[PDB]
């Protein structure tokens, strides 16, 4: 027979995986809406999915935040049902043969910095900023970048008093070593500035095709991240951003300078890229590389 | 047979002397890792080790604080094993022909000011700030400045009431006289302002290569101190910092004006240098002087 979670959610193909497990394609039969079901094995060891849902619900209403359909349990699984979105930026990147033009990077950067700014206004740091955790909407929302996966996210200040978490060393879960900030590598607690730094890397990855510390291929020993850490701290911003508009190097440097508790000047950051956008004479249409690909 | 402390670490070369003990090289036989061993003879008239191990423990979790591995009582000694770290800022200074470039000095100044700030948030004052008490980490943490040696550390306010300690004078000089603040030389009770003033002299030591009171000939130690104090008190900060970015002069001045119980504004003090780092067009890379050799 057919497999249906909840009652209304027809389970489907395994379309991917996230932090708390796998992401399956599903269908709300009682509504005919294709949705995304994420299910974590009831008792793994650290049942973090009931936590992620909480965050999504705190962010509910924000621009570019996926809507949650249902949260609950079904046997050996606790399922979260959320809005199915378009391809991730990684998919689109590969789709474009791993080549984003400056305009698209600038067009994207503007929205990515806004999603990041929003999570922070709600007292949280994302902690795992990568091209996979951003998706494009569908249909009418086709030009809006969405931010997903609040698995490694953390509250960085009291939601009432707004008192920032203290400066100490990390005793938590880390994200992708490839887009990690230098502090993450130094073993320091992550905060607002670190989310923006990784973005600097995501942006440079989109411009470069791949990062310099990417694919070092180390030995069988436990830490390959030691090489990444090194390659990363040894590669100066001026060399990394070589051959590109200074706004990118100026972006990374600024983020590196910020103190653990400084509130970032987001507008300044949006300002750098917009000025460059207007300079190169770009129209602010939401026509991206992947839209032009249909004509060659 | 082989010298084995607590049946866990083999003892090695004495690599120095802490505030009240000797630091020996050690090897966690099991994990093979290199550690640092501090020893205090049980028959000491002024046991501090049990006090110091406690302080390191309170400090645990802070950025740049060394880890204590084990504490044990051997036959004739009390033992405190802690993680071994990299070279100190003195060993690197000397390695670098005793010359630190502006950005290396600024990049360190920021971390050094963070550590002191941290300790103060824990209700303690270091009271012996010098380059020897600052060590770089190992491997990936090799870009992190650590603070060590809490042997002379004193609590400056109640752990609960936060009632700052009383003003007292006629005290004795505590710490290296070369970096000791003018107040320390005047036998005045130490507080937060003193830890930061001394850090000031440490920065200029890195800039200048030597300090105006360093090298005075004297036989008697109190005579030594008397001379050092004289030169120090008689050397204008404006003159001292001659030719270096005013920020340093601004720093020492600020420090020498905080009232005894004043809560230093560590952000302003850091903002000076971060602003200077910025005006010099310095970029944020973790490559230091010693890395260009």
CB A69 within 8 Å of CB A28: yes
Residue A115 makes CB contacts below 8 A (sequence gap 6+) with: A63, A64, A65, A134, A145, A146, A147
Asked if residue A128 lies in contact with residue A121, where contact means CB atoms within 8 angstroms, the answer is: no
User: What are the residues of chain A with a beta carbon less than 8 Å away from any beta carbon of chain B?
Assistant: 167-169, 171, 182, 185-188, 226, 229-230, 233-234, 236-238, 249, 252-253, 256-257, 259
Tell me which residue in A171, A186, A238 faces B140 most closely, judged by beta carbons: A186
Contact B187, B175 (CB under 8 A): no
- Give the Å distances, CA to CA, from B109 to B259, B266, B272, B274, B286: 23, 12, 11, 10, 14
Confirm whether residue B23 is marked as ligand binding: yes
Going by DSSP bridges, is the β-strand pair B145-147/B134-136 parallel, antiparallel, or unpaired? antiparallel
Question: CB–CB of B136/B145 below 8 Å?
Answer: yes
What number of other Cβ atoms are within 10 A of residue B266's Cβ? Answer: 17
Q: Starting from the edge strand earliest in sequence, which strands make up the sheet with B9-18, in order?
A: B4-5, B9-18, B21-28, B34-41, B77-83, B68-73
CA–CA separation, A200 vs A127, rounded Å? Answer: 14
Which positions in chain B touch A234 (Cβ < 8 Å)?
A: 287
Method of determination used here = X-ray
Residue B35 CB burial class (10 angstroms; 0-12, 13-18, ≥19): buried
- Sole residue written with tokens 């028959």: B43
A19 labeled part of a ligand binding site: yes
What's the rounded Cα separation, in Å, for the pair A243 and B83? 43
Q: Which residues contact B247 (CB under 8 A, 6 or more apart)?
A: B272, B273, B275, B276
Tokens 């010298």 belong to which residue?
Answer: B3
Contact between A229 and B140 using a beta-carbon 8 Å cutoff = yes
Residues 6 or more apart in contact with residue B105 via CB below 8 angstroms: B203, B206, B207
Q: How far apart are CA B185 and CA B176, in angstroms?
A: 11
Taking each helix axis from N to C end, the angle separating A102-121 and A266-279, rounded to the nearest 10 degrees, works out to: 160
Q: How many CB atoms lie within 10 A of CB B192?
A: 25
Q: Judge contact between B234 and B278, C-beta under 8 A.
A: no
DSSP state of B76: S
Residues in B whose CB is inside 8 Å of some CB of A read: 61-63, 114, 118, 139-141, 143-144, 267, 270, 274, 277-278, 283-287
Distance from C-alpha of B86 to C-alpha of B142, rounded to nearest angstrom: 7
CB A196, CB A255: distance < 8 Å: yes
Largest CA distance in chain B: 61
Resolution (angstroms) equals 2.5
- Cα of B286 to nearest chain A Cα, Å: 6
* CB within 8 Å: A186 and B141: yes
What are the structure tokens assigned to B126, written together? 């270091």
Count CB-CB contacts under 10 A for residue A285: 10
Residue A23 labelled as part of a binding site: yes
User: Considering only CB atoms, which chain A residues are within 8 Å of B141?
Assistant: 186-187
Q: Is residue A18 annotated as involved in ligand binding?
A: yes
Contact B277 A257 (CB under 8 A): yes
Partner residue facing A236 (CB), from B139, B278, B285:
B285
Tokens of B173: 């000089």
> Cβ(B168)–Cβ(B189) under 8 Å?
yes
What are the structure tokens assigned to A184, written together? 């993450």
Q: How far apart are CA B200 and CA B184, in angstroms?
A: 14
* Rounded CA separation B62/B58 (Å): 9
Distance (Å, rounded) from C-alpha B111 to C-alpha B136? 11
Residue A38 labelled as part of a binding site: yes
For the record, the structure tokens of A202 come out as 């995501």
Burial of A59 (0-12, 13-18, 19+ CB in 10 A): buried
Chosen for mutation from B285, B290, B291 (greatest number of chain A CBs closer than 10 Å) is: B285
Q: Closest CB to B284: pick one of A187, A188, A256.
A: A256
Longest dimension (CA), chain A: 60
Token look-up 């978490």 returns A165
Please list the residues that pair with A27 across neighbouring strands.
A10, A34
Note whether B5 and B23 are within 8 A (CB): no
Q: Which residue of B has its CA nearest to A261?
A: B267
Q: Can you give the length of chain B in residues?
A: 293
Task: Report how far apart, in Å, the C-alpha atoms of B227 and of each of B177, B178, B224 are.
Answer: 10, 11, 5
Q: Which residues on chain B are in Cβ contact (under 8 Å) with A169?
A: 61-63
Determine if residue B6 is labeled as part of a ligand binding site.
no
Distance from CA of A235 to the nearest CA of B (A): 8
In this complex, do A259 and B270 lie within 8 Å of one another by their Cβ atoms?
yes
User: Which chain A residues are closer than 8 Å to B284 by Cβ?
Assistant: 237, 252-253, 256-257
Residue B178: exposure state from Cβ atoms within 10 A (0-12, 13-18, ≥19): middle
* C-alpha pair distances (Å), B74 with each of A170, B13, B39, B45: 34, 18, 10, 18
Environment class of B289 (CB within 10 Å of its CB; exposed 0-12, middle 13-18, buried 19+): buried
3-state secondary structure chain A: CCCEECCCEEEEEEEEEECCEEEEEEEECCCCEEEEEEEEECCCCCCCHHHHHHHHHHHCCCCCCCCEEEEEEECCEEEEEEECCCCEHHHHHHHCCCCCCHHHHHHHHHHHHHHHHHHHHCCEECCCCCHHHEEECCHHHCCCEEECCCCCCEECECCCCCCECCCCECCCCCCCCCCCCHHHHHCECCCHHHHHHHHHHHHHHHHHCCCCCCCCCCCCCCCCHHHHHHHHHHCCHHHHCCCCCCHHHHHHHHHHHCCCCCCCCHHHHHHHHHHHHHHCCCCCCCCCHHHHHHHC
Nearest CA in chain B to A228: B140
On chain B, the residues whose CB falls within 8 A of the CB of A256 are 284
The reply to whether residue B63 touches residue A185, judged by beta carbons under 8 angstroms, is no
Residue B225 to residue B186: CA distance in whole angstroms: 11
Measured in residues, chain A has a length of: 296
- Residue B191, φ and ψ in degrees, nearest 5: -155, 180
User: How many whole angstroms separate alpha carbon B48 and alpha carbon B262?
Assistant: 28
Q: Structural domains in chain A? A: 12-25+36-85 (3.30.200.20), 86-296 (1.10.510.10)
Contacts of B14 (CB under 8 A, 6+ apart): B22, B23, B24, B25
B68 marked among binding-site residues? no
Residue A84, token pair as written in the block: 């199915």
Cα distance between residue A256 and residue B285, in whole Å: 9
Report d(CA B53, CA B65) in Å as an integer.
12
**Among A76, A110, A128, A285, which one carries the catalytic annotation?**
A128
User: Are residues A253 and B62, on separate chains, in Cβ contact within 8 Å?
Assistant: no
How far apart, in whole angstroms, are the C-alpha atoms of residue A132 and residue B11? 51
Shortest distance, CA A133 to any CA of chain B (angstroms): 27
Those residues whose C-beta lies under 8 Å from the C-beta of residue B156, and which sit 6 or more positions away, are B120, B123, B124, B125, B164, B165, B190, B191, B192
Among candidates B152, B160, B83, which has minimal Cα distance to B124? B152
Pair of tokens at residue B47: 């046991």
Cβ neighbourhood burial of A221 (10 Å; 0-12, 13-18, 19+): exposed
Yes or no, beta carbons of A233 and B144 under 8 Å apart: no
Distance in angstroms (rounded) separating the CA atoms of residues B220 and A9: 88
Give the 3-state DSSP-derived string for A26-72, with helices as H, strands as E and coil as C: EEECCCCEEEEEEEEECCCCCCCHHHHHHHHHHHCCCCCCCCEEEEE
User: What whole-number distance in Å separates Cα of residue A163 and Cα of residue B270?
Assistant: 20
């Amino acid at each position: 027979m057919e497999l249906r979670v909840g009652n209304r959610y027809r389970l489907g193909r395994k379309i991917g995986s996230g932090s708390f497990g796998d992401i399956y394609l599903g269908t709300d039969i009682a509504a005919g809406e294709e949705v995304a079901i994420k299910l974590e094995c009831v008792k793994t060891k650290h049942p973090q999915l009931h936590i992620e849902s909480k965050i999504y619900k705190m962010m509910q209403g924000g621009v570019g935040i996926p809507t949650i359909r249902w949260c609950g349990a079904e046997g050996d699984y606790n399922v979260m049902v959320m809005e199915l979105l378009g391809p991730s930026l990684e998919d689109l990147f590969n789709f474009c043969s791993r080549k984003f033009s400056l305009k698209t990077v600038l067009l994207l950067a503007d929205q990515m910095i806004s999603r990041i700014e929003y999570i922070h206004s709600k007292n949280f740091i994302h902690r795992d900023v990568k091209p996979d955790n951003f998706l494009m909407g569908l249909g009418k929302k086709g030009n809006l970048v969405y931010i997903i996966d609040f698995g490694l996210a953390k509250k960085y200040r009291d939601a009432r008093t707004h008192q920032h978490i203290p400066y100490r060393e990390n005793k938590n879960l880390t994200g992708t070593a490839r887009y990690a900030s230098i502090n993450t590598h130094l073993g320091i607690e992550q905060s607002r500035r670190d989310d923006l730094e990784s973005l600097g890397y995501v942006l440079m990855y989109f411009n470069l095709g791949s990062l310099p510390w990417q694919g070092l291929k180390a030995a069988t020993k436990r830490q390959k991240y030691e090489r990444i850490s090194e390659k990363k701290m040894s590669t100066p911003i001026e060399v990394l951003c070589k051959g590109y508009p200074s706004e990118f190097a100026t972006y990374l440097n600024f983020c590196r300078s910020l103190r653990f508790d400084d509130k970032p000047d987001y507008s300044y950051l949006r300002q750098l890229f917009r000025n460059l956008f207007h300079r190169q004479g770009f129209s602010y249409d939401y026509v991206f590389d992947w839209n032009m690909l249909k004509f060659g």
